[PDB]
């Protein structure tokens, strides 16, 4: 932490700076967009936007 999250579900990138993530994968969250629907995160595979409710804080 204090910004460490884990993916709840698979999410396939749809372009537009989004990031593919796999259930169980760890992320570090940089922040959220204006309405909180999108979350900008970093994983071992890169950096991009993922659905906010597709992840949850761990540790």
């Amino acid at each position: 932490d204090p910004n460490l999250f884990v993916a709840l579900y698979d999410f396939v990138a749809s372009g537009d700076n989004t990031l593919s993530i796999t259930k169980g994968e760890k992320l570090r969250v940089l922040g959220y967009n204006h309405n909180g629907e999108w979350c900008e995160a970093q994983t071992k595979n890169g950096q991009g936007w993922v659905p906010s409710n597709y992840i949850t804080p761990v540790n």
């Binding site: 700076n17 999108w38 936007w49 409710n53």
Partner: peptide, 10 residues
């Protein structure tokens, strides 16, 4: 961030 909404869970 994208200007369209993300897919709903799950």
């Amino acid at each position: 961030a994208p200007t369209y909404p993300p897919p709903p869970p799950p």
